[PDB]
Structures are given as structure tokens and as C-alpha cells.
Amino acid sequence: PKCPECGQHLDDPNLKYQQHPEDAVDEPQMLTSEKLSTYEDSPMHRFTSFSVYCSRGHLCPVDTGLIEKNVELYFSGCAKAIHDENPSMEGGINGKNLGPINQWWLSGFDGGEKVLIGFSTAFAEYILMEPSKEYEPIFGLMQEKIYISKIVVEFLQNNPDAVYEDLINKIETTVPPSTINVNRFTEDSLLRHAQFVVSQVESYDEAKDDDETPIFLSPCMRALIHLAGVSLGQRRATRPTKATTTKLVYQIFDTFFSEQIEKRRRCGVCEVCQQPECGACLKRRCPNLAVKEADDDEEADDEMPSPKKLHQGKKKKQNKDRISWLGQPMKIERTYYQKVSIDEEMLEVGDCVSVIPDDSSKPLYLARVTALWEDKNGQMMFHAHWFCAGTDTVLGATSDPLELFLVGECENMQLSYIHSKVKVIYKAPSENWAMEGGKTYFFQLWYNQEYARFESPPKTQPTEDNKHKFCLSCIRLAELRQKEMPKVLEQIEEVDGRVYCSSITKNGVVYRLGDSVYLPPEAFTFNIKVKKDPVNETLYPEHYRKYSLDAPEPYRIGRIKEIHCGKKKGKVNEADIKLRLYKFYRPENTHRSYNGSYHTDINMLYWSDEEAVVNFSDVQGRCTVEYGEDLLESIQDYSQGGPDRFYFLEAYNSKTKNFEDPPNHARSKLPKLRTLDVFSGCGGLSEGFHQAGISETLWAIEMWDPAAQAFRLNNPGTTVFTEDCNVLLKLVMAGEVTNSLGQRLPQKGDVEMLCGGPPCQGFSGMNRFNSRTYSKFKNSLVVSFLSYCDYYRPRFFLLENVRNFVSYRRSMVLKLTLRCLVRMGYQCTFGVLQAGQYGVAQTRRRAIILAAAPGEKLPLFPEPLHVFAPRACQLSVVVDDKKFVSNITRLSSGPFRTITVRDTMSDLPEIQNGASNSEIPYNGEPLSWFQRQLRGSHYQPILRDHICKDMSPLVAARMRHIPLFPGSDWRDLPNIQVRLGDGVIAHKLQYTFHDVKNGYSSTGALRGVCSCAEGKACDPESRQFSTLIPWCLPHTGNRHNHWAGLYGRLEWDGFFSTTVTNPEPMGKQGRVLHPEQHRVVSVRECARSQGFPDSYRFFGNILDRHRQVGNAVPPPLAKAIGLEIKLCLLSSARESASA
Ligand SMILES: Nc1ncnc2c1ncn2[C@@H]1O[C@H](CSCC[C@H](N)C(=O)O)[C@@H](O)[C@H]1O
């Protein structure tokens, strides 16, 4: 038996019938009482001892949607004076069967701790107070629901951009009052109330409206929507940051607005899609569409062939009047060079010209007249070194219509193709350019299309043997062809039509006999060597979902024995340079294989008497393979001394599979820049830079206290400013010497290098800019950061960001950043790097913007040192449908093996879920090479931050029950009733519906967790909570790739999905459970995943430490970049050491 009106099952032991007061009169009568009377027509009244019930007398909830489902609900209790705050049944009239509830509503989501619950009837609006003793339970749950909703709304008003793991933490950590009979809230509760909470939050945006972003569209909100299948649109309840910029930086962002700035996939089936109309108002917009759009704005598009070279390209001839030479010829060559030519008016060498092309792609071609001459066919010729227009560079629209750029484009042309003489000025930097922080065609930098490098022009020089032919574009190409040229330097004595040599060259590297060489895994070979059963589906109902590229080998190493080659007609054929090498085994290449690749050094080799022949083309680079037993310093000291340094102590007998000693033929300052790390964090970026020996941080700016604190502990000589960089900048700009706290503010000339990670939050999307999006970026921390650069003018600049920075806002964010630096007159470039390729067991791509002052050199992006899964390695950038790449050649292979989770944390003592002891002994030695380095050669007794979050009894239980086999997640959980330690009991998942797309289990059992599996609309109450297999995961599984690896354990041979900031198992941060322990990863494990030395200190609570680390730039990546700035400095030091 179950009610025809409300639906309640009569056998329900928690059912209750309506119990009435005496003086209870019908609604119109009780509303005519004199005990009764904001800008509306009601009348509004208070209401106490209330009870809500169906037409038959069953006490009913109001949240459940029965009002919506047309079910007439009647209420009863004491009504009071609008002003009467007493919830004691005393100053009012009792009403009975009070009008069917037209609708119910809420008010109290701002500067108001109280949340009011009102009902609307055919006659009056009532404000509820206390329920009746019989209704109390029913109102109880409803109340709890309302509270989570409040916490969720309030938090989001204060923190939009909040991620799912934060929401969870906000909820988790909020202490509810006594008035709410819940000890504390959990992810389980939020997920359980996920529909009420979301539908409440939607309503807050519909109600309190601004031109601002709907709170239901925040990352955490959409995350909760996708995780717990939620129906959007079921709504009901109603009732000027400015960047501290310099004139120059302001001007750029101010003009882009006053130029390039101009201004429907509705769902149909939703409750918002079924409601008219607006000019009654200005909003009726679909929430399901709103999400799809909000989600698509988050994703980019990463193949595409090389961009076409400019000016190749058709130009059209002009004049037939009088072109005659002027003066005596400069020189002779079949060609006769001149200095002046008169095409009606005077035209000298080194003047600029305009060339009218074919009326199609219509920009006017611009060129520097390099040379003037007459060819053997008496035709008047010229050499046109082309200029690139601002719009034709990466910059595009962002550039000055008058700014031109020098390119590696030149061609010979007849004097007919010339249109006119054009005034082209070189906007050279001032004598004092560093102090400068706050018409016709001009130029400033040299642009390399292939690598988006804006650089300071050479200058020069024109020798008297080429003062007539002087083409920089021709010189560059010549130098390039020379380096790319395989050439013999010294030869011994020739043999059977092949010359034996002692030294060869290519790419700028000189290869001698005995020097070691890198080659692809295909280059040679070593002496090689040579079905699932039935799962219990009753126990593992979700395993069916389980169903349904990897890193290459590092370079093959060889030592040079012979440089024999080939011969062409008379002399040596460079196309035929061959090498005879002694093959070097890596421990992995031995019979040992993967066990060799464990505790061994990343750079240890095994000598072999084996030999191979390979072309000098196949050679990737040169390295240093030395015998350690004949060594000057320790193996560590030699290894840590410089690049491409390997060693061998024994020799591998490939045949006997044994280790003999090797044969006897196998035997033998840096100016640290004064740095300012803006958005310093705990100092991971500064760390890699200090590791590089190229810097010293003297001023670090951190807004968040726990981070700045952690910085100081690692950098004691740094003036850590715990402010908003915007106030800090305004003070120097105001002329201050010191801040409130009496700390010396950095002054112009004090900062040699600027570096930082400006967080992009108010505009971090992909779609076209807009009035909203632009205003947010106009004042962004990117613009505050570029102002710092403009004011201070450091020798070197770095802006590290999220890889998508490069793609953000139809790549406009990157185009404007590059524009800024060019306006100032800085050499600059962008580029993407995968941290994993730099010695970290994590897959994280970062956008890196390098900038360098005119005078210094522009650094290159570091060559990858570690072999990584190709998928994780897409570094290319498509800007305005042109593919931009970095100088990185190693695409592809690398010199060292991959760093794995195993190498990252295999040595750490066992810790249980909820570990709290900050300082503990290691209780053992380091095992991996990686461990040895972060633990250090110097003995450390204490292990720090091996602290791990305390997960709930339920989550804790779930983790115990996640198998240890690689790549194991939720889908492996058993459907078993776990005793949650405490009174609470995690029960089985009830499988009551049919999955029409997944079928039946092997046992003929159902797979459906909710009515929507059938194709119908989700029936609530079919929702389950506190289940071992989270109910929400089968609920949405199908539409979200079976919830990938949520509750997944890290693979020992795997990596970290990303930079983990708050480890949650159903989180957007990847696999977070430890490979073997029934817990989530500890702070130190994360710190290790970042390649931080075990000495590295962290401040605040567990979560602050977690944030500090997952915010950091991994020191290995920072050092890699720092090392590129290293060469850039030494090179510029020897260059500024002449006569
Ligand atoms: N307006 C502002 N002014 C100064 N610092 C800010 C800021 N807003 C955010 N921050 C800081 O921005 C930092 C970004 S994380 C930076 C990573 C870092 N360079 C490293 O390798 O550790 C955070 O640590 C945050 O607290």
C-alpha cells in the first residue's frame, strides 16, 4: 500500500499522520484575526509549530518536488505577527488545512547568516519558524540541505574559479551548528544533496543578477554536475580591480580595446527552455547549453604542416622611363656592382624600397636595397633583402601598422620591380635604455618565423671585400649551411678507396677519435632474447567497465674507433662519413634488463668489445664516456660537473653474461643575476635557477602568507615581500625607499632578472575575447607583471604559465604579451616544455615566455634530457593557423631513461591514512638514483612532510579495497558491506534498473543504478549514499568514459597525472592513491614528484603544503631553463671581452 496523493508506502515505519490543534480555523478565517496586519501585496506573516501534509494526512516533505508534480500540499500550525520573533506558540492563531502550497521559497544568501523559508498560498505569504514535534524530522533533512546550499553559495560568491577539491575542502571543514544534527559534512553528503545544492545555486544567479558570471558555472560546480548526474533547470527560490601599470603597458592594452573590440544551441527539453519571456525581462538562457559552452571554452586544439615562407610570392614590374647608373662601379665579379642608380630620382645602396605585388593578398612588399649591379646580359639588377610587416609576425593585429621586422628573406630582382623609395628608421635603444621605464615606417628586431624569436639585429659588419654585396639574410644562411655541413677536419692516411680520419664536424660539434657518440635505438643491436579467466560479477558488479603511446629507448652509446667514410671522384665524399664504434651497454640492455634500471645510476654504462658501423648522419650529438677507476674527482662530482657525462666501471661479456674489468684501450666565474621572483610561492622556480648557479633571489613577492613563509626557510638572504605585487609596484612608482614593515624595496638597476608565474583566472578561456573577458585580462596579473618588466628593465625575463596560456583567448593573451615586450624593445620568444622530459615522474606541460634585453642574447629552450611518452610531448603551438615550434630537436629520443613513481618514492617509510607526524626517520637508505640525488650525498636524519591527509571512514574503507595490480581504480571495488569502524555501515549498491546500453551481468544481474539507465528521467530516492562503490560513478559512468581511474593507484612504472595540489580520489587531479598503501599521496611524495630535494622546507597546514608544492615550478625544469640562460651569459661575457 502507498498514497494516491503523495505516494508514501503505508508499511514505511517512518510515516506520520496529521495531528491538529483545537482553535485551528481554516486559512481565510485565521487571516482575518487582529493579531495580524516588504514592498509587496500579501500579507506577510510568521508561522510556527508547522506541519506539511498531503490531501489524506501524510506528513510530506516539500523539497521532493510534489508541489511541482501538481500534488496539493496543505499546512497547519500557529501563525504570528510579521514582527513576532518568538517561536513559542503564544501570540498567534492556529490554522488548519491552510491553502494548497502555490510554491515555497528561500531568502538568505549574502550578508545574512539567517536563511528564511517561506510558503506562498492562494491568500498569503508565510515565513516559517519552528516545526511541530511530529514534523521536526522531515524539516530536519530539508534544513540540512539548505545549509550545504548556503555554504556552497556563500563560498562561491567569495571564490569563483574554485576547483572541485576546494569545494570538497570548504564543505568538509565547515563546522555546522547544533541546530543541524550532522557532526560535519562530507563529499558523500554534497553528492547525496547534489541536485538540491545545484538547483539552489542556479536560482541564486537567476535571482541576484549582475552582468557577472553565474556561480553555477564555476569549475567545482560543473565538476559536481558531471560527477553526480544532476538535472539542470529545476530552479525556485528568489527573495573594480586595476593593474598597477606604467604609461607604456597601459597604452598597449588601452589601444587594443579602442581598436579590435566588437560583439544559440538551446537544449529545448529543459524547465528553463520551457518558459517565456524577455524584451518581460532580459534572461531566459538555458543552463545545459551554458555548461557545454563553459566546458568547451576550457579545451584547446593540439598534426599541422610547416608555415609558408613570406614573399614567395609574386611581385609585378612597373616603369619604362629612364633607369641609368650613377658614378664609377664599386667592384666587379659576370656581374658589375654600382653604388647609385637613377630611376628619374636618386637611389643609393642601403636605401629602402617598396614593391607593388599582384592584386590578391595585398600588403605592399618592403625591402632593403642590399646591392646594385649589371649582369652579363646587360640587365640592371638589385638585391632586395625583405622586411616583415608587424601583422605578418606572430603578433598580428597587436602590432604597430608602421613597425617592420628584419627577416631571412632576400632575392635578386630587376630594377623594374621597384615602386618607390621609402623612409625606414632603426628605433635603436637609448644609451640608458634600462632607466627608460615610465609618421613613417620603423624597425627594431630580427624575426625568425620557424621559432617565433624576436631578436636584436646582428650589427654587422661590412668588410671591404663585401661592402657592396652586404646582405645579412645571405650571411645568416651561409653560417647556417656551414654548421649543418658534415666536414672532415684532419685525415690520417687513406685505404681501399676510403680515407681514415682523426677529426670530423657538424652542427657546431667537433668529433675526434675516442670521443663518444649518441645514436637512435635503431642504429645498432645487442645480443637479444625471447589468457584472462572468469571474474565473480556479484562481488565485482562494476569490473565489466574495465574494458570497455609509451616512452622510447634512450640514445644508443658508442665510442669512436674509426672514421673511414667514402670518396667522390678526386676528394672525400662528405655524404659518406661512416663510423666504427665500440657498443656501450646500459644496465637495462644487459640480461638484468628492468632490474638494471632500478638502483643503478641514471648515467652508468658497461663497456663492450662489441662493434658497429654507422653513418655520421645518424649521430645525434657527442657525450663523455669515461672510466671511473681513473678519475680526478668522485663519480658524483664528475657526473654533476657538466652535460652529457656518463661512466663505466666494468665490462659486459655479452657471451658469458659476466663482468670482467675493462680492456686497457678503453682507458684514458658565472655571474649570478640579482633576481626578483614575482608570485614566488614556496620558491620552486627560484630553486632551479639557484641550482643553475646563474642567479640569487634578493626580492620575492608572495601575497599568500604560508608560501612566502616557506620561501624564507629555503632562501634566508631574500627580502620576501608578503604583499600584492600591485601595491609593491605602486610604492616604487611613488618613489618609496622602504615598505610599512621596513624592508628595502627593489629599485631600477637593482633587478638583473625578472621571473614569475602570474595566475591567469578571470579570462583563462579559449573563445574570442569580449567586453567582459578583455576587462579581466586588461587588469590581469599578466599586465601587472609586464609593468614590472617595463619599469625595472631586467637583462632577463621569464613568465611561466599553464600550457594553455599559449592558446588562451584565440591566442590573444600571448600575442599581446609578445607585443608589450617588442614595444619596450626587448628580444623575446615563447615555447612549451614537458617537465617529465627534464627528470620528473609527472606529466606537466608549461607555457614559457623568454625575454632578454637588447645587448644580452635570447636564450634557447633546453634540450629534453629524459625519454617520455610521445602523447605527453606535444610542444607545437598553432597561432592564427600557423604552427610555431622551439629550437628543441630531441623530439623523440633523449640521453637518459624515464624517471618513474618507483624512482620518485620507492624509499619512503610506510605511513597510514591520516599521517600527522611532520618529522620522522627514513628507517632506510635511498634506493633509486633519483632518490640518492634529492636525499643528497650529505646525510639527513629527519624525513620531512611525509604527512598524508586524513580521509573519511568511508573513503578510507574504499582505498583498503582498491587492489594493488597496476592501473586499478573504483571499477575493482567489491560490492560488500564494510563496517565503517564507527557505528556507521557502508552498505551494498542495490542494482534495480536495466542498463539498456551495458546489458546484463554474467550472473544475469541488472547493471542499472538509476531510472535514467533505462532512458527515463532520473528518479530521486533511487540515489544511494555511503556505498563502497560510489553510486555516482555508475550513475554517470557511460557519459564520462567509465570514470577513467577515479580511486586509482599510481603505477610504480607510471607518472603523476599532473601537479597535485589537493589529493582527492574523485578529483580532477588524476590518480592520487599510493601504489601499495591504503592512502592518498603524502606532501613529500608530491614534493618528490616535483623533484624537490628532501631538505626543501614547507610551511602551514597539510593542505597549504600540498598547494605550495603543486603550485611550484619543478626545480629540474627551472634548472634546465636556467642552464640555457647560463650559456647566454658566458657567451655574452667572452663577447664583451675584446680590445
Ligand atoms: N596578486 C598577487 N600578488 C603577489 N602574489 C600573488 C598574487 N596572487 C597570487 N599570488 C601568488 O601566486 C603564486 C602562483 S604559484 C608560483 C609558482 C612559483 N614561481 C614556484 O616555482 O613555486 C601563488 O603562490 C600565490 O599565492
Ligand SMILES: [Zn+2]
Ligand atoms: Zn499521502
Ligand SMILES: [Zn+2]
Ligand atoms: Zn535548456
Ligand SMILES: [Zn+2]
Ligand atoms: Zn641576401
Ligand SMILES: [Zn+2]
Ligand atoms: Zn539517473
